[PDB]
Amino acid sequence: MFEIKKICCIGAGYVGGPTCSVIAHMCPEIRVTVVDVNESRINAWNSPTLPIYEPGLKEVVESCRGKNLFFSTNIDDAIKEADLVFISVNTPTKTYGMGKGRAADLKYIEACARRIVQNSNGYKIVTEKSTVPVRAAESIRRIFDANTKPNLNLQVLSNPEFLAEGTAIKDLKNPDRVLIGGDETPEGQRAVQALCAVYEHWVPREKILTTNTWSSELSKLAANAFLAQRISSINSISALCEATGADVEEVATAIGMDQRIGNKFLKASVGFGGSCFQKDVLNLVYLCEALNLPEVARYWQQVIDMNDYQRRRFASRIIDSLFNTVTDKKIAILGFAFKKDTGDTRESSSIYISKYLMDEGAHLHIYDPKVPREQIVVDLSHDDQVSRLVTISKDPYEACDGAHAVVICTEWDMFKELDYERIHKKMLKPAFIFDGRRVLDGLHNELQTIGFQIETIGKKV
Amino acid sequence: MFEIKKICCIGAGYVGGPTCSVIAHMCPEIRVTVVDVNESRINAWNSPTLPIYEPGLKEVVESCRGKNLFFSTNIDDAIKEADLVFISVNTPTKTYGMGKGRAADLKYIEACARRIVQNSNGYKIVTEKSTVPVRAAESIRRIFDANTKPNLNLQVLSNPEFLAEGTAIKDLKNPDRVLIGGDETPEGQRAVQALCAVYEHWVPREKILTTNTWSSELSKLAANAFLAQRISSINSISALCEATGADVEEVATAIGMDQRIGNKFLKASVGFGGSCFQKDVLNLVYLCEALNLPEVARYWQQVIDMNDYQRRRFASRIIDSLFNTVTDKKIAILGFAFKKDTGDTRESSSIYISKYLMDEGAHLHIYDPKVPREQIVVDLSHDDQVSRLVTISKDPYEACDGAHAVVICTEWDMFKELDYERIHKKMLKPAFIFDGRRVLDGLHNELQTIGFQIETIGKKV
Amino acid sequence: MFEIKKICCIGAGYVGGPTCSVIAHMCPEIRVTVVDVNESRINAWNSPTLPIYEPGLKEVVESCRGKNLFFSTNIDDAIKEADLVFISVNTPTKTYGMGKGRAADLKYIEACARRIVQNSNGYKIVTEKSTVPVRAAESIRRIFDANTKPNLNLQVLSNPEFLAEGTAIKDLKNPDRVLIGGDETPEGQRAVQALCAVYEHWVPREKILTTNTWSSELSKLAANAFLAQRISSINSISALCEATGADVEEVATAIGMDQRIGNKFLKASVGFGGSCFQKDVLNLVYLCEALNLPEVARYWQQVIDMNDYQRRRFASRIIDSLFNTVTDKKIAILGFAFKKDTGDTRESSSIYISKYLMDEGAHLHIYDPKVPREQIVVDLSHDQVSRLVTISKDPYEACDGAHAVVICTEWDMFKELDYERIHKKMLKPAFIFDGRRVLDGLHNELQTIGFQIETIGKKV
Ligand SMILES: NC(=O)c1ccc[n+]([C@@H]2O[C@H](COP(=O)([O-])OP(=O)(O)OC[C@H]3O[C@@H](n4cnc5c(N)ncnc54)[C@H](O)[C@@H]3O)[C@@H](O)[C@H]2O)c1
Ligand SMILES: NC(=O)c1ccc[n+]([C@@H]2O[C@H](COP(=O)([O-])OP(=O)(O)OC[C@H]3O[C@@H](n4cnc5c(N)ncnc54)[C@H](O)[C@@H]3O)[C@@H](O)[C@H]2O)c1
Ligand SMILES: O=C(O)[C@H]1O[C@H](OP(=O)(O)OP(=O)(O)OC[C@H]2O[C@@H](n3ccc(=O)[nH]c3=O)[C@H](O)[C@@H]2O)[C@H](O)[C@@H](O)[C@@H]1O
Ligand SMILES: O=C(O)[C@H]1O[C@H](OP(=O)(O)OP(=O)(O)OC[C@H]2O[C@@H](n3ccc(=O)[nH]c3=O)[C@H](O)[C@@H]2O)[C@H](O)[C@@H](O)[C@@H]1O
Ligand SMILES: O=C(O)[C@H]1O[C@H](OP(=O)(O)OP(=O)(O)OC[C@H]2O[C@@H](n3ccc(=O)[nH]c3=O)[C@H](O)[C@@H]2O)[C@H](O)[C@@H](O)[C@@H]1O
Ligand SMILES: [Cl-]
Ligand SMILES: [Cl-]
Ligand SMILES: [Cl-]
Ligand SMILES: [Cl-]
C-alpha cells in the first residue's frame, strides 16, 4: 500500500484552505501545502487575519500552520514534492464565448493540469476536487497521456467537496460522506485506496463512498441541483401561500415531517445565493443540451428560473408597497452576505435586490456584520451610480435612520434582536419592513403595534 | 448600327478593372477608361503593383494600359466623352436603417446615375453591371427622364457580371455566357445590339443571351442564390455524414455523377465567403418580403442560415475538441482569403472562425500567402482585442510553433504540402488539425501516425 | 477473384424485376432468379403480360426468361443457391407510431434479413437494392451476427437504384453511374469487387463508383433531395418573376448556361410529384431530426414547403381570378398524371389542385389521355367526388360550359387543342391557367381569341 506523506493543493480559496487545514489537523504526519497564484490571499492565510471568515477556521489554521500546514505562492516546488495534488480552483460560469451564462469555465483547471505535468516526475495522485462538468477528468488524463516522461505515473481521481460555507469546519471534521471516484484499473484502485487512507485518519470507512470517476463528478452536480431544487420548490410554495392565506412555514413543517421528504432545506427566502448552486445547475443544463437531453435541461432550468422569479417579485413587492416609486427614497438593506456566518457575497440575493432598487434610483444604506465595505462597493459596481445611490452603514440603526423601508436579505441572528421601537421613531412614515428570511416571525403583532407595515415571504398581506 | 468607340466604367474594383482590361485587350479600337473616387486605388491600377491580386490580370493591364486602357479619378470627363457608361460600383448590404442586415444599399448606384445625367449630352448607353435588386434600372430611367436636356438620349441596359475572383481573366475571356437586358423598344433594342457588338469581338454570338431588363437583373441574383445553395446543401450533408459515418466527398461524387445535378459546387467547407453570395441572397430575401412573398423569402434564407450553422459548429468543434476551453491557447489560422488565388477577404469564413475563437480569448497566429497583414488587422478589428489576441505570421511554421491546433480555412495548395512532422514536434500536446477545406484528405493516416488528432468536415471522428 | 454465378433477388417489384432482367440479359453466364411472396405477381412475370409496364422490359425479359432469368415463389432454394442475394423489397412510409408520415418502415427488409440468414450456409454477398434509411445495412449485419453459424460469411453491400419512371430500361442499360457501398475491410472489398464485375459486363468501369456503405445509402436520398431542390428553387423564382415582370423561362436559360449550375431540372411547374421525391425528402428530414440535426432538418423541409406553396398559390390564383367564388363553377382539369407520358398519379400536383378546388365547391371535369378514370376517383376520394367530380372522355367535353381550363400535366396534345372551339363554348370571362408552361408561344393568339391567360413565372 502506498502512503501519501506530502499533499499539495492548488487553490487556496473557501475549499482549499479549510479542506487542507482539516487534513493537516487530523493527519499530523502529512505535510500539507496550499498554493495559489494570488499573493495577497496567500499572505493573508499566513497572517492574523485570514482572507475568509469561517467559524472555527482560525483555530484550526493556527494549530497546524508552520508545523504541517503551509501556504505558499511557490506552486512548482509544492507540486514537485507532492505525493498527492488536489485541484481546488474556481470553476465559474463563462461570461463570454460559447455557452456564455451557462457553460462551466474550465480554464483554471486546464492551467493546473498543464502545470502539474510540467513540474511532475515519478508517481503522483492528482485529485479533482473542483466541481466540474462530467468527464472533465478524461481531459486531465488526455493531457497527461500526451505529455508523458519516463517513469511519470500520474493517476487521476475525482474527490468532490460537500462543505457549506458558514459550517465548513464542522462539515469537514464530521462529513455525512466522503466521495472518491477513479477508474477500475489496478493503478486506479491503488490511487483510490491511498486517498481513502488519508480520510480514514478521521472519517469512518462506512462514510467513504468509492465509485467510478464519472458517477463521482455527476454526484456533486446532482447533489447541488437537488439542494437548490428543494429551496426553489419551497420558494414556489411561498408564492402560493401569499395568494391563499396558507403560511409557508406551516406548510414546510407539514411536508418535512414526511420522513421520505425530510425537514431540511425548506426555509423560504428572497432567493438562494452563494458561488455554486446557480452555476452548477447551469453547468448541468448546458451539459444536457450538449448531450442532446433538452427535456432534462429544461427540468433543471426551472430551479434557476424560480430563484430569479422569487427575487424579482420580492423587489417588485418593495416598489409596489412604497406607492409604486422608490426614486430618492432611503432604504435600509440589512444583510449582504449570501447566508449567515460567512463574509462571502458571491451571488448573494442582496446584490440582486440592491441592483433592482438602484435601477429605480433608491438610496440604499447597507449594513452587514461581516462583509467588508469594499466588497459591497465592488459587487454593486458595473461606479457613478454606486457613488450616487449606495451608502455602507456602520450599524443597522444608522441604516434605518430616515429610511422608508427596512429590507432583510440575510438571516443574521442580530436582526430579530434589534430595537424596532427606536427604529420606527426615526423612520419616514409610513414605515415598512420587508423580511426576505422569515427571521421576524412571531414579532409581527408587536411590529404592527409599533406602527410598521410588516411583509414577509410566504405570508399573505 | 451604332458603334461604341469610347467606354467609361465607374467603379475600378474587382469587377470594373478586370472587365475593362479584358474589353480593351479584345477590342483594340475601343478606348476604355476606368474611373473611381478612390485615388489610391486608381494610382495602384497605374502602378507596378495592382490593387488586387488576380491571376493573369497584370499581364492584361500591362498590354493595354496607356494605349486603349486608362485608369483615372477624372470621372466627369470620362463620362462626358463616353458612348457607353458601365455602372460597376459596390452594392453592399445596408448596415443601418430600414432593412439593416438584409436590403441592398443602392446609394453608390444612385450617385452614379446623378453624376451621369449631370455630365452627359447626346446619345449614351448606360449599362448596369452592378448586382442590383430587380427593377433598380427603372429608378435609373426615372432619374434620367426627370432630368432631360435637349438631344440627351440615355438608354439603360442590364449587363450583370458572372466572373468569380481567382479565375476572373479566364471567366472574362471565355464566359459560359454574357447576359444583356433592355426594353423591347426600337431604341432599347438598338442599345442592346450595340453592346452585343462589343462582346462579339471575342464571345461567340450563341453565348450572348438577350432578355428584358428585369429577367436580366433577376437572373444574376438567382444564379448566385443557386450556387450558394449548392454549397449550403452539400455542407448540410457534411453534418449528416459526421453523424453517420458516411463521407461527404464520397456522397458529393455520387450525387454529382447524376448529369442533371452536375459535379460542380459540391465541395464542403467551413462556409462560403466572398463579397456577394450572402448579400445577394439577403437582397433576394428582402425583396421577396417587400413583394409579399414570405414563403420564397424563407426558402432562400435557409441558404444563409445553413452557412452560419456550418461556421459556428466548426468553431464549436475546435473549442469542444480542445477540452472545452481555448483561453490563452495558441492556435494557428492557415488561410484568411475567402478562397484560394485571391487576396480578397470579404466575408471570409476565416474572419468568422477567428472572431469566434477571439471571443474565447484564444491567441490566434494567422498566415495567408496573399492577404496583406494590414487587411487581416482591419478585418478582425471592431482594436485592443486584436493587439492582445492576434499575431500575423510570416510563414505557416511560425504560426504552428507552440500551437495547440492548426485550423485550415482557405484551400491554398501549399497547406497540404507542409512538413507536418516538423510541425508536430514544436506543437503543444495533444496536437490537433482542424481541416475546414478537405485539403488534407488522404494524409489522415500519416498525420495520425505522426500523432495529430485530425478532424475534417463531413467525416466522422 | 470471386465469380458471382447465381443471383437471387428477393422482391419482384418495380426495381427488382427490371434490374434483374437487364443483369440476366447482359450476363448470360449468371443465373438470375427473382423471387417474391406474391404468387400472382410471380406468375404474371412468366406471362405474356408482365406485372410492371416499362418500355423495353418485355423484350428484355423474353430474351432470357427460362434461359438464365427465372421468377419463382420458391424463395428458400433461390437464397440457398445464390452467390449474391439482392434485397429488393419495399420500404413504405410508416402510417403509424414513431415517424408517422415520414419514417421508412423496415419490416420487409428485416423479414428478408432473417430469412436469408436462416437459409444460408457458407459465403454469400447480400446487397441492398431498395431505397432504405441510412444505417439500415447495420441492422442487417446485426441480425446476421446474432444468428451466425459455423462457416457462415454474409457480406453486406449497398447498391441503390436510380430508375426514372418510364425510362427504367434505358436508365439500367446506360446509367449515369452505378453506386456500390461496402465496408473498407478485405472481405467487404472483395464483395464490392465481385458485384462490380457483374456491372462491368455492360457499364464502363469509370461509371461504377464504390464508397462505404453509409455514403452509398445517404447518396440515394441526397440525390433525390438535390433534384427536388432544383425544382423548388426555380418554382420559388417563378413567383418572384410574376411579381417583377421577369420571365422564369428566360431566367432558367440564363442560370442554366452556367456550367456549374447546369440546365437540367429547371422547368418551373405547379409542383413536383411522383412516389419518390416527397417520400425520400421527408425521410431525410426525419433522419436529421433523429440524429439531432435540426438545422439540417429544416433546411431540407423547405423543399417540401416550397412545393406545397407552389400548389397552394396556383389554386388560390384560380379562385381569386374567378371572383373568389367557384361554388358550382365548372372547371376543366387537363392532366392528372404526375408528369406526361404516364398513367401514374402518385403525389401528382393535379390531385392537390383538384382537392383545393373541390373544397370550394367547384365542379371539376378531369381529362387525362392515359390515367384510368378509376384511379382519378380513388385519388380524389377520402361524398364530394360523386357530387363534384366528372371524368371526361375528351378535353372538349371538359371545357364545355367551363369558366377556366387548368393545365396540370405537360401532355404534348394540350398545345394542339382547338382553343377557338373551346373559347366559344366557355363562360365569359374565360380563363386558361397553364401550370406547366406548355402554351408558351400560343399566348398572343389565345389573347386574341379572348382568353385571360395565366401561367407560372410570367404575367402574359
Ligand atoms: N465554496 C464552496 O462552499 C464550495 C463547496 C464545494 C465545492 N466547491 C467547488 O470548489 C472549487 C473552488 O471553490 P472556491 O470557493 O474555493 O473558489 P475560490 O475562488 O474562492 O478559490 C479558488 C482559488 O484558486 C486560485 N487559482 C485559480 N487558478 C489557479 C491556478 N492556475 N494556479 C493556482 N491557483 C489558481 C484562485 O486564485 C483562487 O484563490 C470550485 O470548483 C467550486 O465549485 C466550492
Ligand atoms: N467581386 C466579384 O467577384 C463580383 C462578381 C460579379 C458581380 N459583382 C458585382 O459587381 C459590383 C462591384 O463589385 P466589386 O467587387 O468590384 O466592388 P468594389 O468595392 O471592389 O469596387 C467598387 C468601386 O466603386 C467605387 N465607387 C463607389 N461609388 C462610386 C461613385 N459614386 N463614383 C465612382 N466610384 C465609386 C468604389 O470606390 C470601389 O472602388 C457589385 O455590385 C457586385 O455585387 C462582383
Ligand atoms: O458546492 C458548493 O459550493 C456547496 O453549496 C452549498 O453550500 P453553500 O452555498 O455554502 O451554503 P447553503 O447552506 O447550501 O445555502 C445556499 C443558499 O441557499 C440559501 N438557503 C439554504 C437553505 C434553505 O432552506 N433556504 C435557503 O434560502 C442560503 O441562504 C444560501 O443563499 C451546499 O450546501 C454544499 O453542500 C456544497 O458543497
Ligand atoms: O457575384 C459575384 O460576386 C460572383 O460570386 C461568385 O464568385 P466568388 O464569390 O468570387 O467565388 P466562388 O468560386 O463562387 O466561391 C464563393 C465561396 O464559395 C466557396 N465554395 C465554392 C464552391 C464550393 O464547392 N464550395 C465552397 O465552399 C468558396 O471557397 C468561396 O468562399 C460566383 O461564382 C460568380 O459567378 C459571381 O460572379
Ligand atoms: O427515387 C427514384 O426511384 C427516382 O425518383 C425520380 O424519378 P421520378 O419521380 O419517376 O421522375 P422525375 O423525372 O424525377 O419527375 C418527378 C417530378 O418532378 C417534376 N419535374 C421534373 C423536372 C423539372 O425540371 N421540373 C419538374 O416539375 C416532374 O414533372 C415530376 O412531377 C428520379 O428522377 C430518379 O433518378 C430516381 O431513381
Ligand atoms: Cl472511470
Ligand atoms: Cl449576528
Ligand atoms: Cl424592360
Ligand atoms: Cl499556395
PDB file of N, CA, C and O in Angstrom, chain B residues 135 176-177 212 215 219 229 233 236 240 244-245 247 250-251 254 257 259 284 295 299-300 302, chain C residues 135 176-177 211-212 215 219 229 233 236 240 244-245 247 250 254 257 259 299-300 302 309:
ATOM      1  N   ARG B 135     -35.619  45.598 -60.788  1.00  0.00           N
ATOM      2  CA  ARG B 135     -36.269  46.891 -61.086  1.00  0.00           C
ATOM      3  C   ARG B 135     -35.411  48.108 -60.721  1.00  0.00           C
ATOM      4  O   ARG B 135     -35.871  49.223 -60.884  1.00  0.00           O
ATOM      5  N   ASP B 176     -19.048  31.372 -69.948  1.00  0.00           N
ATOM      6  CA  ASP B 176     -20.143  30.428 -70.253  1.00  0.00           C
ATOM      7  C   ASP B 176     -21.266  31.159 -70.993  1.00  0.00           C
ATOM      8  O   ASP B 176     -21.828  30.650 -71.957  1.00  0.00           O
ATOM      9  N   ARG B 177     -21.575  32.368 -70.534  1.00  0.00           N
ATOM     10  CA  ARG B 177     -22.441  33.267 -71.269  1.00  0.00           C
ATOM     11  C   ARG B 177     -22.291  34.728 -70.822  1.00  0.00           C
ATOM     12  O   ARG B 177     -21.807  35.019 -69.729  1.00  0.00           O
ATOM     13  N   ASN B 212     -35.348  40.747 -71.364  1.00  0.00           N
ATOM     14  CA  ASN B 212     -35.791  42.057 -70.866  1.00  0.00           C
ATOM     15  C   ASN B 212     -34.947  42.465 -69.654  1.00  0.00           C
ATOM     16  O   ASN B 212     -34.214  41.648 -69.095  1.00  0.00           O
ATOM     17  N   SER B 215     -35.662  40.359 -66.187  1.00  0.00           N
ATOM     18  CA  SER B 215     -35.166  38.978 -66.244  1.00  0.00           C
ATOM     19  C   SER B 215     -33.659  38.946 -66.074  1.00  0.00           C
ATOM     20  O   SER B 215     -33.133  38.055 -65.411  1.00  0.00           O
ATOM     21  N   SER B 219     -31.912  37.230 -63.048  1.00  0.00           N
ATOM     22  CA  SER B 219     -31.031  36.107 -63.386  1.00  0.00           C
ATOM     23  C   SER B 219     -29.727  36.099 -62.563  1.00  0.00           C
ATOM     24  O   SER B 219     -29.251  35.039 -62.159  1.00  0.00           O
ATOM     25  N   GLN B 229     -26.596  28.004 -52.716  1.00  0.00           N
ATOM     26  CA  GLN B 229     -27.434  26.881 -52.301  1.00  0.00           C
ATOM     27  C   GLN B 229     -26.789  25.507 -52.505  1.00  0.00           C
ATOM     28  O   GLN B 229     -26.946  24.634 -51.645  1.00  0.00           O
ATOM     29  N   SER B 233     -26.217  23.170 -49.313  1.00  0.00           N
ATOM     30  CA  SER B 233     -26.803  21.824 -49.386  1.00  0.00           C
ATOM     31  C   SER B 233     -25.764  20.735 -49.129  1.00  0.00           C
ATOM     32  O   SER B 233     -26.004  19.847 -48.317  1.00  0.00           O
ATOM     33  N   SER B 236     -24.787  21.025 -45.492  1.00  0.00           N
ATOM     34  CA  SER B 236     -25.819  20.333 -44.686  1.00  0.00           C
ATOM     35  C   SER B 236     -25.587  18.809 -44.697  1.00  0.00           C
ATOM     36  O   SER B 236     -25.817  18.107 -43.692  1.00  0.00           O
ATOM     37  N   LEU B 240     -24.649  15.548 -41.619  1.00  0.00           N
ATOM     38  CA  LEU B 240     -25.244  14.196 -41.631  1.00  0.00           C
ATOM     39  C   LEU B 240     -24.225  13.065 -41.739  1.00  0.00           C
ATOM     40  O   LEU B 240     -24.419  11.982 -41.185  1.00  0.00           O
ATOM     41  N   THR B 244     -23.187   9.932 -39.169  1.00  0.00           N
ATOM     42  CA  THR B 244     -23.496   8.577 -39.631  1.00  0.00           C
ATOM     43  C   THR B 244     -22.310   7.705 -40.032  1.00  0.00           C
ATOM     44  O   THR B 244     -22.455   6.485 -40.083  1.00  0.00           O
ATOM     45  N   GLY B 245     -21.162   8.310 -40.339  1.00  0.00           N
ATOM     46  CA  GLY B 245     -20.018   7.564 -40.856  1.00  0.00           C
ATOM     47  C   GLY B 245     -19.964   7.541 -42.377  1.00  0.00           C
ATOM     48  O   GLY B 245     -19.020   7.005 -42.965  1.00  0.00           O
ATOM     49  N   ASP B 247     -19.201   9.609 -45.782  1.00  0.00           N
ATOM     50  CA  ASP B 247     -18.169  10.601 -46.062  1.00  0.00           C
ATOM     51  C   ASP B 247     -18.707  11.568 -47.115  1.00  0.00           C
ATOM     52  O   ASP B 247     -19.182  11.135 -48.138  1.00  0.00           O
ATOM     53  N   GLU B 250     -17.383  11.313 -50.708  1.00  0.00           N
ATOM     54  CA  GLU B 250     -17.967  10.150 -51.375  1.00  0.00           C
ATOM     55  C   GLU B 250     -19.395  10.434 -51.846  1.00  0.00           C
ATOM     56  O   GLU B 250     -19.750  10.158 -52.996  1.00  0.00           O
ATOM     57  N   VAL B 251     -20.199  11.010 -50.960  1.00  0.00           N
ATOM     58  CA  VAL B 251     -21.565  11.384 -51.284  1.00  0.00           C
ATOM     59  C   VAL B 251     -21.647  12.445 -52.394  1.00  0.00           C
ATOM     60  O   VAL B 251     -22.492  12.339 -53.305  1.00  0.00           O
ATOM     61  N   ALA B 254     -21.043  10.843 -55.691  1.00  0.00           N
ATOM     62  CA  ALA B 254     -22.180  10.019 -56.130  1.00  0.00           C
ATOM     63  C   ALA B 254     -23.292  10.900 -56.703  1.00  0.00           C
ATOM     64  O   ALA B 254     -23.818  10.632 -57.796  1.00  0.00           O
ATOM     65  N   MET B 257     -22.462  12.739 -60.154  1.00  0.00           N
ATOM     66  CA  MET B 257     -22.399  11.881 -61.339  1.00  0.00           C
ATOM     67  C   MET B 257     -23.761  11.762 -62.036  1.00  0.00           C
ATOM     68  O   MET B 257     -23.814  11.368 -63.182  1.00  0.00           O
ATOM     69  N   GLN B 259     -26.096  13.520 -64.142  1.00  0.00           N
ATOM     70  CA  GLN B 259     -25.851  14.633 -65.062  1.00  0.00           C
ATOM     71  C   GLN B 259     -26.853  15.787 -64.912  1.00  0.00           C
ATOM     72  O   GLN B 259     -26.554  16.927 -65.266  1.00  0.00           O
ATOM     73  N   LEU B 284     -32.281  39.144 -52.244  1.00  0.00           N
ATOM     74  CA  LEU B 284     -33.400  38.344 -52.716  1.00  0.00           C
ATOM     75  C   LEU B 284     -34.465  38.162 -51.636  1.00  0.00           C
ATOM     76  O   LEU B 284     -35.643  38.378 -51.900  1.00  0.00           O
ATOM     77  N   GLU B 295     -42.939  33.073 -48.212  1.00  0.00           N
ATOM     78  CA  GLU B 295     -42.548  31.675 -48.413  1.00  0.00           C
ATOM     79  C   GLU B 295     -41.263  31.619 -49.201  1.00  0.00           C
ATOM     80  O   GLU B 295     -40.334  30.862 -48.849  1.00  0.00           O
ATOM     81  N   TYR B 299     -37.503  30.319 -47.881  1.00  0.00           N
ATOM     82  CA  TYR B 299     -36.794  29.301 -48.669  1.00  0.00           C
ATOM     83  C   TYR B 299     -35.315  29.681 -48.876  1.00  0.00           C
ATOM     84  O   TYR B 299     -34.406  28.888 -48.632  1.00  0.00           O
ATOM     85  N   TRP B 300     -35.081  30.897 -49.337  1.00  0.00           N
ATOM     86  CA  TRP B 300     -33.733  31.334 -49.634  1.00  0.00           C
ATOM     87  C   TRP B 300     -32.923  31.621 -48.380  1.00  0.00           C
ATOM     88  O   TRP B 300     -31.729  31.357 -48.368  1.00  0.00           O
ATOM     89  N   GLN B 302     -32.772  29.969 -45.737  1.00  0.00           N
ATOM     90  CA  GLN B 302     -32.128  28.725 -45.334  1.00  0.00           C
ATOM     91  C   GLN B 302     -30.691  28.586 -45.828  1.00  0.00           C
ATOM     92  O   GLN B 302     -29.866  27.990 -45.143  1.00  0.00           O
TER      93      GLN B 302
ATOM     94  N   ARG C 135     -27.947   3.655 -42.493  1.00  0.00           N
ATOM     95  CA  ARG C 135     -27.556   2.676 -41.460  1.00  0.00           C
ATOM     96  C   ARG C 135     -28.501   1.462 -41.325  1.00  0.00           C
ATOM     97  O   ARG C 135     -28.361   0.671 -40.393  1.00  0.00           O
ATOM     98  N   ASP C 176     -25.984   6.819 -65.623  1.00  0.00           N
ATOM     99  CA  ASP C 176     -25.008   7.872 -65.331  1.00  0.00           C
ATOM    100  C   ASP C 176     -23.926   7.347 -64.405  1.00  0.00           C
ATOM    101  O   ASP C 176     -22.736   7.589 -64.628  1.00  0.00           O
ATOM    102  N   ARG C 177     -24.343   6.614 -63.375  1.00  0.00           N
ATOM    103  CA  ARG C 177     -23.418   5.821 -62.574  1.00  0.00           C
ATOM    104  C   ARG C 177     -24.097   4.637 -61.893  1.00  0.00           C
ATOM    105  O   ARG C 177     -25.326   4.607 -61.729  1.00  0.00           O
ATOM    106  N   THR C 211     -18.081   3.234 -52.668  1.00  0.00           N
ATOM    107  CA  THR C 211     -17.971   4.054 -51.460  1.00  0.00           C
ATOM    108  C   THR C 211     -18.068   3.140 -50.229  1.00  0.00           C
ATOM    109  O   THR C 211     -18.130   1.909 -50.370  1.00  0.00           O
ATOM    110  N   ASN C 212     -18.064   3.725 -49.036  1.00  0.00           N
ATOM    111  CA  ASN C 212     -18.502   2.995 -47.842  1.00  0.00           C
ATOM    112  C   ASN C 212     -20.029   2.840 -47.880  1.00  0.00           C
ATOM    113  O   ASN C 212     -20.714   3.478 -48.707  1.00  0.00           O
ATOM    114  N   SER C 215     -22.194   6.082 -46.907  1.00  0.00           N
ATOM    115  CA  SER C 215     -22.117   7.011 -48.027  1.00  0.00           C
ATOM    116  C   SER C 215     -23.091   6.583 -49.151  1.00  0.00           C
ATOM    117  O   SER C 215     -23.823   7.406 -49.697  1.00  0.00           O
ATOM    118  N   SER C 219     -26.320   8.781 -50.209  1.00  0.00           N
ATOM    119  CA  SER C 219     -26.237   9.345 -51.554  1.00  0.00           C
ATOM    120  C   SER C 219     -27.541   9.251 -52.343  1.00  0.00           C
ATOM    121  O   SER C 219     -27.870  10.162 -53.109  1.00  0.00           O
ATOM    122  N   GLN C 229     -34.905  19.874 -54.985  1.00  0.00           N
ATOM    123  CA  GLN C 229     -34.498  21.229 -54.589  1.00  0.00           C
ATOM    124  C   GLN C 229     -34.314  22.169 -55.777  1.00  0.00           C
ATOM    125  O   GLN C 229     -34.593  23.364 -55.677  1.00  0.00           O
ATOM    126  N   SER C 233     -36.487  25.454 -56.146  1.00  0.00           N
ATOM    127  CA  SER C 233     -35.755  26.713 -56.305  1.00  0.00           C
ATOM    128  C   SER C 233     -36.223  27.510 -57.522  1.00  0.00           C
ATOM    129  O   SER C 233     -36.414  28.721 -57.426  1.00  0.00           O
ATOM    130  N   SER C 236     -39.759  28.795 -56.775  1.00  0.00           N
ATOM    131  CA  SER C 236     -39.710  29.971 -55.910  1.00  0.00           C
ATOM    132  C   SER C 236     -39.408  31.210 -56.756  1.00  0.00           C
ATOM    133  O   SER C 236     -40.003  32.272 -56.551  1.00  0.00           O
ATOM    134  N   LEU C 240     -41.471  35.126 -57.896  1.00  0.00           N
ATOM    135  CA  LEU C 240     -40.828  36.440 -57.951  1.00  0.00           C
ATOM    136  C   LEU C 240     -40.905  37.059 -59.367  1.00  0.00           C
ATOM    137  O   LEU C 240     -41.095  38.267 -59.517  1.00  0.00           O
ATOM    138  N   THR C 244     -42.463  40.753 -60.661  1.00  0.00           N
ATOM    139  CA  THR C 244     -41.442  41.733 -61.072  1.00  0.00           C
ATOM    140  C   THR C 244     -41.390  42.041 -62.567  1.00  0.00           C
ATOM    141  O   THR C 244     -40.646  42.928 -62.967  1.00  0.00           O
ATOM    142  N   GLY C 245     -42.167  41.329 -63.382  1.00  0.00           N
ATOM    143  CA  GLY C 245     -42.112  41.489 -64.845  1.00  0.00           C
ATOM    144  C   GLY C 245     -41.005  40.673 -65.504  1.00  0.00           C
ATOM    145  O   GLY C 245     -40.699  40.877 -66.687  1.00  0.00           O
ATOM    146  N   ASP C 247     -39.421  36.799 -66.590  1.00  0.00           N
ATOM    147  CA  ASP C 247     -39.927  35.555 -67.156  1.00  0.00           C
ATOM    148  C   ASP C 247     -39.045  34.397 -66.667  1.00  0.00           C
ATOM    149  O   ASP C 247     -37.840  34.364 -66.921  1.00  0.00           O
ATOM    150  N   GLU C 250     -36.832  32.675 -69.247  1.00  0.00           N
ATOM    151  CA  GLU C 250     -35.638  33.451 -69.559  1.00  0.00           C
ATOM    152  C   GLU C 250     -34.586  33.310 -68.452  1.00  0.00           C
ATOM    153  O   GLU C 250     -33.386  33.131 -68.728  1.00  0.00           O
ATOM    154  N   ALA C 254     -30.755  31.594 -68.562  1.00  0.00           N
ATOM    155  CA  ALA C 254     -29.620  32.415 -68.128  1.00  0.00           C
ATOM    156  C   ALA C 254     -28.813  31.693 -67.040  1.00  0.00           C
ATOM    157  O   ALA C 254     -27.598  31.537 -67.169  1.00  0.00           O
ATOM    158  N   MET C 257     -27.041  28.169 -68.200  1.00  0.00           N
ATOM    159  CA  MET C 257     -25.869  28.291 -69.047  1.00  0.00           C
ATOM    160  C   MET C 257     -24.589  28.381 -68.245  1.00  0.00           C
ATOM    161  O   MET C 257     -23.523  28.317 -68.825  1.00  0.00           O
ATOM    162  N   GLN C 259     -22.160  26.477 -66.392  1.00  0.00           N
ATOM    163  CA  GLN C 259     -21.887  25.028 -66.330  1.00  0.00           C
ATOM    164  C   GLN C 259     -21.688  24.471 -64.910  1.00  0.00           C
ATOM    165  O   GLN C 259     -21.731  23.269 -64.707  1.00  0.00           O
ATOM    166  N   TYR C 299     -33.604  22.859 -43.106  1.00  0.00           N
ATOM    167  CA  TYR C 299     -33.040  23.247 -44.411  1.00  0.00           C
ATOM    168  C   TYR C 299     -33.750  22.446 -45.528  1.00  0.00           C
ATOM    169  O   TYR C 299     -34.313  23.002 -46.475  1.00  0.00           O
ATOM    170  N   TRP C 300     -33.774  21.133 -45.379  1.00  0.00           N
ATOM    171  CA  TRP C 300     -34.394  20.271 -46.387  1.00  0.00           C
ATOM    172  C   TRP C 300     -35.913  20.314 -46.393  1.00  0.00           C
ATOM    173  O   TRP C 300     -36.504  20.140 -47.450  1.00  0.00           O
ATOM    174  N   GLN C 302     -37.735  22.853 -46.344  1.00  0.00           N
ATOM    175  CA  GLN C 302     -38.080  23.912 -47.283  1.00  0.00           C
ATOM    176  C   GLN C 302     -38.390  23.431 -48.708  1.00  0.00           C
ATOM    177  O   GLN C 302     -39.247  24.010 -49.402  1.00  0.00           O
ATOM    178  N   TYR C 309     -46.362  25.224 -51.283  1.00  0.00           N
ATOM    179  CA  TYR C 309     -46.747  26.615 -51.566  1.00  0.00           C
ATOM    180  C   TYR C 309     -47.039  26.847 -53.067  1.00  0.00           C
ATOM    181  O   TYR C 309     -47.994  27.539 -53.423  1.00  0.00           O
TER     182      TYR C 309
END
